[PDB]
Structures are given as C-alpha cells and as structure tokens.
Amino acid sequence: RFLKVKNWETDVVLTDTLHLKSTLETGCTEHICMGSIMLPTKDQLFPLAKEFLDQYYSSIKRFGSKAHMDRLEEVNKEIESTSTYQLKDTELIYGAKHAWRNASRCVGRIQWSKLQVFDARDCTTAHGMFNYICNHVKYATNKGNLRSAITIFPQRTDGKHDFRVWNSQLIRYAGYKQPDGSTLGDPANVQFTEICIQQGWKAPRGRFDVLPLLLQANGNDPELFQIPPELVLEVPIRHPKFDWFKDLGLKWYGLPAVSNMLLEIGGLEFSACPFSGWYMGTEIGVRDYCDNSRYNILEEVAKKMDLDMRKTSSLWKDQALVEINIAVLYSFQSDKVTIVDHHSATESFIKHMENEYRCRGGCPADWVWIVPPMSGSITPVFHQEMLNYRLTPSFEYQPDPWNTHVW
Amino acid sequence: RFLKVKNWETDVVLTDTLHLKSTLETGCTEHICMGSIMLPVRTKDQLFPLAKEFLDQYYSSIKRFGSKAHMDRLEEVNKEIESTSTYQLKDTELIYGAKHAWRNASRCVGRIQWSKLQVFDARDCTTAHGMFNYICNHVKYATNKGNLRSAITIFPQRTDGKHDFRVWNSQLIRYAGYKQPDGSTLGDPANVQFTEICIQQGWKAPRGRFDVLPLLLQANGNDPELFQIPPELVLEVPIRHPKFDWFKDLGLKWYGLPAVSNMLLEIGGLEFSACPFSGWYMGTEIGVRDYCDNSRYNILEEVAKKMDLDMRKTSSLWKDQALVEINIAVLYSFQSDKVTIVDHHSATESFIKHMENEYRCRGGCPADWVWIVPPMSGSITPVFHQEMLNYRLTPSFEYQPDPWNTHVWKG
Numbered sequence: 001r002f003l004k005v006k007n008w009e010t011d012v013v014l015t016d017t018l019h020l021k022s023t024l025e026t027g028c029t030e031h032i033c034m035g036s037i038m039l040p041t042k043d044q045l046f047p048l049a050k051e052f053l054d055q056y057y058s059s060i061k062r063f064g065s066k067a068h069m070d071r072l073e074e075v076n077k078e079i080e081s082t083s084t085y086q087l088k089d090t091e092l093i094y095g096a097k098h099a100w101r102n103a104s105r106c107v108g109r110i111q112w113s114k115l116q117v118f119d120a121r122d123c124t125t126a127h128g129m130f131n132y133i134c135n136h137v138k139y140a141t142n143k144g145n146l147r148s149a150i151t152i153f154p155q156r157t158d159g160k161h162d163f164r165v166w167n168s169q170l171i172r173y174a175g176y177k178q179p180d181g182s183t184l185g186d187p188a189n190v191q192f193t194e195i196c197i198q199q200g201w202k203a204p205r206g207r208f209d210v211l212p213l214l215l216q217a218n219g220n221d222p223e224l225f226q227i228p229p230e231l232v233l234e235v236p237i238r239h240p241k242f243d244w245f246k247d248l249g250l251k252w253y254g255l256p257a258v259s260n261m262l263l264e265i266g267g268l269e270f271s272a273c274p275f276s277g278w279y280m281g282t283e284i285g286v287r288d289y290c291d292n293s294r295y296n297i298l299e300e301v302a303k304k305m306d307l308d309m310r311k312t313s314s315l316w317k318d319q320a321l322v323e324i325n326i327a328v329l330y331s332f333q334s335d336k337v338t339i340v341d342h343h344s345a346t347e348s349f350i351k352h353m354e355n356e357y358r359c360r361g362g363c364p365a366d367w368v369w370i371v372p373p374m375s376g377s378i379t380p381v382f383h384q385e386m387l388n389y390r391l392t393p394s395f396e397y398q399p400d401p402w403n404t405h406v407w
Numbered sequence: 408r409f410l411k412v413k414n415w416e417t418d419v420v421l422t423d424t425l426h427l428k429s430t431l432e433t434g435c436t437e438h439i440c441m442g443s444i445m446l447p448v449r450t451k452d453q454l455f456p457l458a459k460e461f462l463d464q465y466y467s468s469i470k471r472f473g474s475k476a477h478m479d480r481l482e483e484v485n486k487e488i489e490s491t492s493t494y495q496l497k498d499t500e501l502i503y504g505a506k507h508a509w510r511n512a513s514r515c516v517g518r519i520q521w522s523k524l525q526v527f528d529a530r531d532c533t534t535a536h537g538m539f540n541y542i543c544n545h546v547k548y549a550t551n552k553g554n555l556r557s558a559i560t561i562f563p564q565r566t567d568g569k570h571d572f573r574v575w576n577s578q579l580i581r582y583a584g585y586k587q588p589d590g591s592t593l594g595d596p597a598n599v600q601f602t603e604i605c606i607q608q609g610w611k612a613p614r615g616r617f618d619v620l621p622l623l624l625q626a627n628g629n630d631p632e633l634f635q636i637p638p639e640l641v642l643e644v645p646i647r648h649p650k651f652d653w654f655k656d657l658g659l660k661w662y663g664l665p666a667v668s669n670m671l672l673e674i675g676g677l678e679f680s681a682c683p684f685s686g687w688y689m690g691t692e693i694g695v696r697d698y699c700d701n702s703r704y705n706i707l708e709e710v711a712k713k714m715d716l717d718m719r720k721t722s723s724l725w726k727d728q729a730l731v732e733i734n735i736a737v738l739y740s741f742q743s744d745k746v747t748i749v750d751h752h753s754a755t756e757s758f759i760k761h762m763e764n765e766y767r768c769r770g771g772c773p774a775d776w777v778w779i780v781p782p783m784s785g786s787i788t789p790v791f792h793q794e795m796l797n798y799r800l801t802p803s804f805e806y807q808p809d810p811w812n813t814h815v816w817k818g
C-alpha cells in the first residue's frame with residue numbers, strides 16, 4: 001500500500017502514496033508484467049465528475065466549501081437533465097495541465113504547469129479547426145522560442161459526432177511506396193499519405209513533404225487543409241565538424257505536436273486535442289533518423305565516416321549514432337530553435353520527480369519510455385526506480401480514425 | 408488464454424501460451440506496474456506439489472510422462488519427503504533443473520546458450536575448504552584459457568535454514584574497493600562493504616585499484632572462511648584502444664569471467680543457496696556499467712579529457728562519445744587476447760532468434776525488457792523494438808539478501 005522507490009546511483013529512497021489514488025488498469029497482473037507492451041452513460045459519469053471536481057476544489061484550497069458543494073450540485077443537475085456537462089474554463093485549464101502532469105511516458109513534465117490552453121470548444125466546422133490549429137502552430141513555434149500549448153476541440157457527445165485530427169502529429173512528412181520496392185520519405189506515414197491522395201491531395205512526391213491536415217468536425221467526413229508553409233519552421237541538419245553532413249540533405253521540423261490522442265477530464269472525452277512542446281534531440285537523431293523502419297540513415301552516415309562496417313564489434317553503428325545526434329542538436333541550437341539534450345532532460349526529470357514526491361506523494365513514470373534510446377545508463381533516469389500507474393485527467397491512445405469512420 | 412507480443416520494427420506478432428504455467432508473483436497488479444523495481448524453511452505440505460510439478464516437467468521433457476519410471480519416481484520422492492521432510496535430486500534431474508533455471512531467467516540476454524551448461528555437482532561438499540576446491544576447479548574449467556565455457560557448481564541444498572551453504576562474494580571474481588578518509592574511493596566502490604568485511608576477517612589488503620578479492624565461504628551454516636583464488640587461475644585483460652595509443656595509460660584492466668555467486672537456485676521446491684554460475688561477458692557490462700556508472704569506476708571525464716572533447720555543455724554529447732570509444736576498447740582488448748566476449752549487437756540479435764525459437768517450440772519466452780535492452784545504444788538493437796512478457800517460471804534463479812545481514816555468528 002505504501003511503496004518505496006530507490007535510486008541505485010544515489011541511494012535516495014522515495015515513498016509513493018499517490019498510487020492509491022490510481023483509477024485505470026495497467027495491463028499487468030500478479031502473474032504477468034506488460035511493462036513493455038506499447039498498447040496494453042449517466043451512471044458512469046457522475047462518479048468521474050465528482051472525483052475530478054473534488055481534486056480541483058482541493059487544489060484551490062476550497063475543499064468542502066459552499067462553492068465546492070454548489071458546483072457538484074450544478075454538475076449533478078446538468079448530467080441528470082442533459083446526460084453530460086460542461087467544464088468551466090478554470091476546470092478545463094486545470095484538467096489539461098494535469099493530464100500532462102499524469103502522462104507517465106513524458107520526460108518533459110517539469111514544465112507541466114506552464115501550458116498555454118486554447119479553448120476551441122466553440123468550433124463547429126473543419127475550416128474552424130484548421131484556423132485554430134494554424135494559430136496553435138504559430139503560437140507554440142514563436143519564431144523558434146517554443147512554448148507548450150494544447151488546443152481543445154468540442155467533447156464527445158453520442159460518439160457519432162466526434163472531432164478528430166486524422167494526422168498522428170500536426171506536422172509530419174509523407175511516405176510513398178515506390179515501384180523500386182523501396183520507400184521514399186517517412187515509412188511511418190505511408191498509409192496516411194495514401195488516404196490523403198485518395199481524398200484528393202496532390203503529393204509533391206519528395207523526401208520531406210509536410211503532410212496536409214485531415215480534419216473531422218462533428219463526426220463529418222474529414223476534409224483536407226495545407227498548413228501555411230511559412231508557419232512550419234524546419235531545420236536543415238549539419239554537423240559542427242563534418243562538412244559532408246549537410247550533403248545528406250537532412251531536415252526535421254521544430255514543432256513536435258501530438259494530434260491523435262484523447263484527453264479525458266472529469267469523465268468528459270476530448271477526442272481532438274492537439275498538444276505540443278519542444279524536442280529532445282534523441283527523438284529525431286536516434287529514432288526518426290536511425291530506426292530501421294524510419295529514415296534508416298546509419299549505413300549512409302557510417303560510410304561517409306569511413307568506418308569499418310565489416311563487423312558489428314567495431315561499434316560503427318554506435319559511433320555514427322552519436323554523430324547524427326551531435327548534428328541534430330547543433331543544427332537546432334544554431335538556428336535558435338528550442339531543443340533539449342537527453343542529459344539535461346533526464347536531469348530535469350529527476351528533479352521533477354523529487355518535487356512531485358515531496359509535494360504530491362509520487363509521480364507515475366514509465367521507465368521503458370523515460371530512459372532515452374541511446375546512452376541509457378549514463379542518464380540518471382536509468383538508475384531510478386519508477387512506479388507506473390494511471391491517474392486522471394489523462395491522455396489516452398485512440399485508434400486511427402480510418403478504422404472507426406463510416407464515410 | 409493467448410497473449411500476443413508485437414515487434415514494432417518487423418510487425419512480427421508472436422503468441423504466448425507458456426505464461427499459463429507461471430505461478431510466483433511479479434510485483435505488479437492491475438493498478439501498478441513494478442517492471443523497473445530491482446527487487447519487487449519449507450513445510451512438507453508445500454513441498455510435494457512443487458516436487459511433482461518439476462518431476463512431471465522433467466518426465467515430459469524426456470518423453471516418459473506417465474511411464475512406470477515416472478510413477479515410481481513420484482512415489483519414491485513422496486515417501487522420502489514424508490519420511491525425511493525433504494528429498495534428493497537424481498543427477499539427471501539436477502542437470503535438467505539447472506539448465507531450466509537459466510532458460511527461465513528473464514533478465515538474461517545470453518539464453519540462446521542455455522542447453523550448453525556444464526553442471527558440477529558439489530552436493531557431497533562439507534567444508535569451506537571443500538567449497539574453495541570446487542570453486543577453483545569451476546574457475547579453471549570455465550576460463551579454459553580464454554575460450555570460456557558456461558558452468559555452474561551446485562553446493563548442498565538448504566535443510567533447516569540454519570545450515571546454509573553460502574558464497575558471501577556476490578561474484579567469484581571482483582575487485583576490492585577502499586573508502587578513503589578524504590571521502591574518495593580507491594578501486595571499485597560497489598565492493599567497499601564486502602572489502603571491509605574481508606579485511607575485518609583478516610585479509611591483507613594490497614590497497615590498489617584492481618585487487619582481486621578473496622573468497623569468503625560458508626559451509627553448513629558455519630562462520631565463513633577466507634581463501635585467496637590462485638592468481639594464475641584469474642584471467643585478466645589489459646584494456647587498450649585500437650586507435651588511441653594513450654588508452655593503455657589509463658591503467659585499466661578487467662577480469663574475463665563473470666560468475667554470479669549470491670543467487671539461489673530453486674529446483675522442484677528445493678533451495679540451493681550456493682550455486683555459483685558463469686558465462687562470458689557482453690562488452691557493455693564492463694565498458695558502460697563497470698567503467699562509466701557514476702557509482703563505479705566513473706572514467707568518462709578522464710577519457711573525454713584525453714580525447715579533448717568539448718566538456719563545457721552536455722549537448723556536445725561528450726559523454727556519449729567517450730562512452731562509445733571505451734566500449735570499442737573493451738571489445739578490441741578481449742578479442743586481441745582471445746578471451747570470449749560478445750558485442751551488444753550480436754548478443755541482442757541472437758536473443759531475438761532465441762526468443763522466436765522458444766515461442767515456436769515452447770509457447771513463450773519470459774523476458775524482462777528493462778534488463779534485456781543494453782545500457783547504451785538501446786534503440787539501434789532489435790530488442791528495444793520487441794514487446795516482451797515478463798513472468799516467473801521454475802526452476803529459477805532468485806535474489807537473496809547478503810549473508811552478513813542474516814548470519815548468526817558462532818565466533
């Protein structure tokens with residue numbers, strides 16, 4: 001019931017009590033751990049509302065006050081009559097910030113209270129969605145001095161009128177399977193690109209074509225919009241020492257912005273809620289560039305470095321990996337686009353954990369995602385025991401809409 | 408039931424049924440995952456089902472389930488348990504059990520090897536001196552002048568828990584650590600507490616950076632006794648770098664034989680509290696953890712200094728660059744001296760093939776991702792992208808507390 005987490009580098013032990021407030025299920029049982037699996041009515045709603053409103057009124061030091069009891073009363077009345085309820089602005093803001101605070105896979109949460117919340121609940125059409133999203137993109141980008149933001153579209157009603165952004169991120173590159181058998185662009189995005197073309201997009205057919213948005217308002221068929229090119233800040237990738245690096249023709253975008261997740265606050269479901277921060281360098285340099293199923297660039301880079309690729313034991317993959325990651329960080333920093341390295345981010349997270357343990361009684365953290373995909377044990381998070389559990393408000397994965405949607 | 412694991416690089420999906428045979432707990436519940444927690448005297452009544460599960464598993468493995476041999480063995484074991492409160496394994500059952508505890512070790516990336524294990528039966532041992540001899544023989548056999556062979560040496564099982572065999576060393580070969588009055592540590596900081604124990608017990612400490620610790624051995628619940636492994640049996644590798652001539656002057660070396668000596672082997676309900684086992688190293692164990700952990704030899708700074716890297720900001724990735732060079736050096740050094748070692752790319756690739764084989768022939772392969780993924784270059788190894796299921800099968804190796812925390816001193 002009361003649980004200890006130990007840091008094996010520093011011997012610091014912290015005690016977790018926050019997990020007792022956990023609500024949802026983990027995927028694990030006493031017989032099987034699923035820690036490494038990527039995807040493990042009126043009646044239901046009033047408890048969820050009450051749970052949330054209690055935590056909110058507690059946060060503003062007015063728990064069990066008349067304003068507390070009056071709002072619980074009001075939400076209760078409203079669910080009774082209408083089958084749902086509407087969050088106050090103060091509650092929506094609190095809820096969005098806490099969904100981020102509770103996101104166990106996010107190493108960037110020291111920042112959680114500084115989130116700019118854009119209330120797009122008054123949106124009704126796909127053109128409106130497009131407008132809201134351009135404004136989000138411009139605000140968050142801020143000419144390279146990035147600011148965290150979320151834009152929240154209307155909540156689910158009967159579920160036949162869902163707002164969705166069909167894109168997985170606001171900004172992503174097209175992928176095209178070629179006669180050649182190879183893939184041009186991002187292999188992650190082949191299926192979505194086909195949907196875009198099939199819906200009428202005219203693809204430039206290059207290696208870094210920013211995808212159009214596919215927006216679904218009010219459960220209608222999604223429509224296509226292109227983000228103003230001038231709002232998408234991109235960074236050409238060069239290396240501080242290797243002059244040939246630029247010749248690889250690599251670039252990435254400045255703004256990481258997840259658009260396929262579902263935000264749950266007080267039992268209400270916000271199925272379109274694009275959110276953004278800034279990159280940790282490894283995300284681009286290790287994963288986007290070096291995953292065999294992605295741009296898969298290790299081979300080309302190692303060749304330009306003139307390394308012995310004959311045997312795995314020469315660690316050519318590892319050498320080229322480091323360089324690619326030095327290049328990414330240098331390029332963002334030179335163009336003054338906000339980026340964080342995995343050493344600084346993980347150090348920040350350890351501090352955030354201590355804060356959360358001290359002020360909140362714990363911090364749900366998923367070690368499998370928090371530990372960077374390179375140089376794991378030379379980051380402090382590797383040595384830090386973490387407990388993973390699900391608190392609400394939360395961000396949840398949801399299925400790609402082309403499976404749900406009836407055209 | 409059926410559980411599926413996906414590999415996100417290949418889209419290959421595997422189906423686990425083996426997890427239905429799991430019994431012990433994981434630490435996890437439907438409300439909390441403890442997948443990153445390092446650490447998440449039997450009665451007769453408990454013992455006969457444990458013996459029976461094991462014997463049914465053994466007899467099935469030799470295609471003799473339900474034979475007269477199988478039935479007669481169950482009867483014989485049952486009678487021994489009710490008569491003596493315990494039982495003895497046949498040599499064949501002991502071998503099978505030891506191999507299976509390895510096959511079942513979910514934190515072990517080297518399991519493709521599991522069926523090649525030399526088992527030394529040391530159940531006739533009675534004294535610390537006897538244990539010393541057995542362990543010397545294990546070291547010499549496993550070392551094989553650099554052509555390393557996996558092995559385990561199994562000392563007598565637990566009886567009343569007051570007569571335990573234990574190796575107090577956590578590994579058979581490890582280096583001393585000495586806390587200095589000024590707060591610095593000489594040698595390996597992981598081994599300071601044990602080093603102080605050896606010293607107190609009468610060890611004459613050379614007080615250098617790589618002093619091989621003496622063995623501290625407990626037989627039959629007695630106070631443990633000190634013994635020095637003959638130095639000519641302890642194979643070591645001086646670490647040098649293929650391109651950097653100054654790497655040798657760091658004065659680094661490491662031992663060739665990784666040999667765990669503090670774990671408990673459970674077979675059919677019986678508990679083998681002293682069961683030292685050894686394989687060969689994966690390079691990162693030394694180059695990443697032993698050399699570069701802040702709490703271990705902590706060489707990153709010195710290496711990066713010598714390399715003249717920009718050390719004013721982490722974003723130059725100086726630590727990452729030094730890290731790779733050190734690991735190249737370890738692999739090169741072991742290879743040049745013809746001492747078995749495997750790189751983390753080779754080891755993980757073989758583990759995936761092993762895992763897929765097991766899913767096909769066994770219905771599963773319990774694996775702990777947190778431990779299986781290497782501590783450098785995680786996602787450029789195939790295991791990073793492989794979903795895994797962790798659960799506990801027996802026979803098994805288990806952690807046990809250090810014996811100095813529990814021992815009743817006789818004086």
Ligand code: HEM
Binds near residue numbers: 111148149
């Ligand atoms: C401000 C700087 C931020 C940093 C440096 C950061 C860092 C990260 C990183 C490295 C990941 C792993 C991404 C991956 O492997 O694909 C992640 C995941 C995540 N973060 Fe953040 N984060 C930031 C801001 C945010 C914000 C603003 C939110 C929400 C408001 C958020 C919620 C999440 C969620 C839900 C995930 C898991 C995503 C998934 O399941 O695919 N983070 N964070």
Ligand code: HEM
Binds near residue numbers: 509520685778
């Ligand atoms: C044959 C070559 C082998 C290789 C390359 C290898 C590889 C590894 C590695 C890298 C670890 C993680 C070490 C760490 O982080 O501390 C490990 C853990 C382990 N392996 Fe092996 N292994 C080998 C043989 C063996 C043998 C012979 C056994 C027993 C018969 C064994 C049982 C284990 C166990 C029980 C662990 C978990 C240790 C603990 O919890 O402290 N492995 N293996």
Ligand SMILES: Cc1cc(N)nc(CCc2cncc([C@H](CN)Cc3cc(C)cc(N)n3)c2)c1
Binds near residue numbers: 169258275277278
């Ligand atoms: C807000 C934010 C900040 C930041 N620094 N990075 C991000 C990364 C977003 C992202 C980019 N590319 C891929 C992903 C995820 C996989 N790593 C997508 C994903 C896939 C699956 C199967 C499950 C899941 N939960 N999430 C997430 C978001």
Ligand SMILES: Cc1cc(N)nc(CCc2cncc([C@H](CN)Cc3cc(C)cc(N)n3)c2)c1
Binds near residue numbers: 685
């Ligand atoms: C048979 C074998 C082969 C191989 N390649 N490597 C090994 C490494 C053994 C080892 C060496 N140094 C430390 C450890 C473990 C953690 N890494 C010790 C440990 C500590 C704790 C707190 C728990 C635990 N289960 N195990 C294990 C053994």
Ligand SMILES: C[C@H](O)[C@H](O)[C@H]1CNc2nc(N)[nH]c(=O)c2N1
Binds near residue numbers: 038
């Ligand atoms: C199977 C495994 O869970 C999967 O490859 C994970 C591992 N850790 C990760 N960690 C982060 N931050 N992001 C990821 O996409 C993944 N992928």
Ligand SMILES: C[C@H](O)[C@H](O)[C@H]1CNc2nc(N)[nH]c(=O)c2N1
Binds near residue numbers: 008385386777779
């Ligand atoms: C806290 C965390 O579980 C701990 O640092 C683990 C992580 N993964 C590991 N993996 C291996 N192979 N060996 C270890 O000692 C550890 N330590």
Ligand SMILES: [Zn+2]
Binds near residue numbers: 435
């Ligand atoms: Zn778990």
